[PDB]
Amino acid sequence: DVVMTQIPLSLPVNLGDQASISCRSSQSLIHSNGNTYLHWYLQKPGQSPKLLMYKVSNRFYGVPDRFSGSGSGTDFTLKISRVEAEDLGIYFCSQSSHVPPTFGGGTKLEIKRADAAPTVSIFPPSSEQLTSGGASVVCFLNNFYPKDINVKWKIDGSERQNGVLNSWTDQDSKDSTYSMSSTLTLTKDEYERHNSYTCEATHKTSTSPIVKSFNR
């Protein structure tokens, strides 16, 4: 299959800016009829793809004048010119020069934010949960930026890796930060028999990790 890869996975942009997603082909896309079937879809959150660009540089009906298209052979590039609220989403690059037509991994267009460190909070096993014998501990890492963040569970001093279940909000549209939440599940019993419980976050804005804890 013609592996299509496109980088970067995210592209922090300022509305105002120009941007440029780039994309690349394992084999070439110059077809026996001398033609290149590289196309560009844009998929807005919770929706279906919309064609933007076909055959490298030809815009599609409706899609506006900021969407210059380019590249050749094996490296094609899409450049939005003054980004807008309207064109934020996942950009997929696709090839139909060969068969089966394959799709590029996508690139998220995101808003650029002044860094923010996570306000983290740890929460212990509720009584009610304990009275049926399971103990989820929970740590909310809220309103941070960038999305890169590393929460570990220091569980009595010695770290643990099983039962962690992370979930992640997408960019909050009011303040462009991300928020993540980690629940470490436990058997009530197990819980019963260990003291310190420390949720902890490695994230740019502190060369120290951020650590919050409760002793059992």
């Binding site: 079937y37 196309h39 279906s48 793809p49 919309k50 064609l51 076909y54 055959k55 599609f60 997929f92 696709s94 139909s96 089966p100 037509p101 394959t102 799709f103 991994g105 996508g106 306000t119 909070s121 740890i122 929460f123 212990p124 509720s126 009584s127 009610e128 949960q129 049926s132 989820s136 929970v138 909310f140 809220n142 279940l165 992370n166 979930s167 992640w168 909000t169 909050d172 009011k174 928020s179 993540m180 939440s181 629940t183 599940t185 919050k212 409760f214």
Partner: protein, 219 residues
């Protein structure tokens, strides 16, 4: 409104079968190919196969042979995809899309049909409250949360004080944890409100006809 319209989402058990439909209106059905595209969670947009309305002949990317079956009720102008021996890995959104013959792009896309395949039975959620264990505040806001766990199927709605705390609320996307879902909202209020002022959390799970309210009260 020239468009491909697709069926609603199904929920099946590993082992039954689905016939997804795609009725095209507004264009000469037979002048375009119908292609099938599969979006799996965080896996590539994966092309499945294509059906030619002129001949009537499908082509399947190798991958989807065996169990996936394209077909067509051209009299009624509706493409169909059918999957049998359904198996957990077939959970995804199937999109159908107007394949063009000149230019080979896909210009009209259908809305997509999510197929979920699981063997949980419907389960109402347990919603535990999370109150801060004496961890006395950093600044001036205090942050509480509800742990909605053990449910199937999605959706679960979570509001705080029946819609009246919304800025400050972050709900996190459901995750499997042995066949069932787990979710968590968090509200961040001023510290003059809690515990001086009731903060309660409202999860409704429509699929089991359940709604609970928990009041976060200190620990």
């Amino acid at each position: 409104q020239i468009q491909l319209v697709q069926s609603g989402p199904e929920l099946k058990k590993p082992g039954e079968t689905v016939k997804i439909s795609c009725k095209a209106s507004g264009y000469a059905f037979t002048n375009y190919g119908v292609n099938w595209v599969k979006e799996a969670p965080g896996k590539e947009l994966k092309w499945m196969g294509w059906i030619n309305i002129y001949t009537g002949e499908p082509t399947y990317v190798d991958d989807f042979k065996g169990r996936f079956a394209f077909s067509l009720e051209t009299s009624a102008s509706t493409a169909y995809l059918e999957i049998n021996n359904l198996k957990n890995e077939d959970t995804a959104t199937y999109f159908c899309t107007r394949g063009d013959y000149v230019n080979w792009y896909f210009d009209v896309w259908g809305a997509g049909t999510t197929v979920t395949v699981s063997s949980a039975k419907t389960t109402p959620p347990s919603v535990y409250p999370l109150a801060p264990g004496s961890a006395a505040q950093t600044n001036s806001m205090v942050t509480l949360g509800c742990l909605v766990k053990g449910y199937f199927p999605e959706p679960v709605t979570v509001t705080w004080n029946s819609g009246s705390l919304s800025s400050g609320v972050h709900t996190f996307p459901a995750v499997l944890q042995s066949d069932l879902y787990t979710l968590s909202s968090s509200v961040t209020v001023p510290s003059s409100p809690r515990p001086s002022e009731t903060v309660t959390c409202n999860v409704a799970h429509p699929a089991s006809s359940t709604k609970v309210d928990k009041k976060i009260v200190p620990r």
